[PDB]
Structures are given as structure tokens and as C-alpha cells.
Swiss-Prot record:
Residue range from the parent sequence: 1334 to 1493 of 2474
Membrane association type: Peripheral membrane protein
Function, as annotated: Seems to be essential for minus-strand RNAs and subgenomic 26S mRNAs synthesis. Displays mono-ADP-ribosylhydrolase activity. ADP-ribosylation is a post-translational modification that controls various processes of the host cell and the virus probably needs to revert it for optimal viral replication. Binds proteins of G3BP family and sequesters them into the viral RNA replication complexes thereby inhibiting the formation of host stress granules on viral mRNAs.
Lineage, uppermost ranks: Viruses, Riboviria, Orthornavirae, Kitrinoviricota, Alsuviricetes
Annotated protein name in UniProt: Non-structural protein 3
Effect of V36 to E/F: Almost complete loss of mono-ADP-ribosylhydrolase activity
Binding residues for ADP-D-ribose: D13, N27, G35, G115, V116, Y117
Post-translational modification note: Phosphorylated by host on serines and threonines.
Organism in which the protein naturally occurs: Chikungunya virus (strain S27-African prototype) (CHIKV)
Effect of Y117 to V/W: Almost complete loss of mono-ADP-ribosylhydrolase activity
Amino acid sequence: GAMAPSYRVKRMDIAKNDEECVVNAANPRGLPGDGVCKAVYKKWPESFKNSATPVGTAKTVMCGTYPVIHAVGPNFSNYTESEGDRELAAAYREVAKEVTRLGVNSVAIPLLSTGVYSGGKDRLTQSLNHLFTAMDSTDADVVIYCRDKEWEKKISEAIQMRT
Ligand SMILES: [Cl-]
Ligand SMILES: [Cl-]
Ligand SMILES: [Cl-]
């Protein structure tokens, strides 16, 4: 575990992270995809061997000794608000189990279902609160990755609010 487990946020490409493992915002079929998933495919393509997994689950595949945790959030274009919320919470719970099992001291994580799976809605708060619910009981250093300057400020404020 980390000496003083923390949350941090950075605005940059998660493929350039400084953590001991990465969470991919994956599709259920293990395809290269777009956005975070395509950057993850270009950096760790070996990790997409048998990475397909259902919605609300996470599947870890090694790239050398570097773990890639493929976490599949719901696409809110297809799910109801109610069922999507349940699947989004579940995907983060499975990420917490994988991070624990791997024994890593740090993890890079994107906000699941906030991009092309958002169904056109701002889900910063919804996705971040499910991230916290899952990861609060883990002792890894968590570094959240985002691309938007306004999202960086709101995520940083939410972390600081809990002190
Ligand atoms: Cl960057
Ligand atoms: Cl997404
Ligand atoms: Cl973002």
C-alpha cells in the first residue's frame, strides 16, 4: 500500500501515466475503440489479447509486467439512467478488487462513461462519486486523468472538499 494513500488529478494523456498500473475505459469486445481506449491500444497493444469482458466488469491483462485493467462502463445511449447507474458503480467496484489483487501501490484511472458513453450528458460528479465509493477502501495512490481544463478544476475541488 501507499504510505499515505491519496487522490490526485492530472490533465494529460493516461498513456503517459507515472503509476504502477492503468485502467482502460474499455469496450466490451476488446476492440481498439477511440479516445482513452485507442491511446491505451497504441501504448499497450499486447494487453488486448482476450480482453473482452461484459459491461460492469473489469479484466486485467499484462503488457510485460505492467497491468492494464480493462473496465467496461455502460453506454448511456443504450442503458436507462437507473440500469446505467448500477453498471457504472459495479465497474468501479471490480476495478477496486483488481487493484487490490495486483498489490500495486498506485493506479492511473479515467472517469468511466464520461466521453462517448455519456449519452450526451455531463456525468463528472456521477462517475467521480462511484470512483470514490469503490476506491476509498483501497490503499493505492489514485491518480485521475482528464483532458478538459474545467473538469481538472472540478475534480481537484471535489478531492480537496473531503480534505
Ligand atoms: Cl498529454
Ligand atoms: Cl466513455
Ligand atoms: Cl475530460
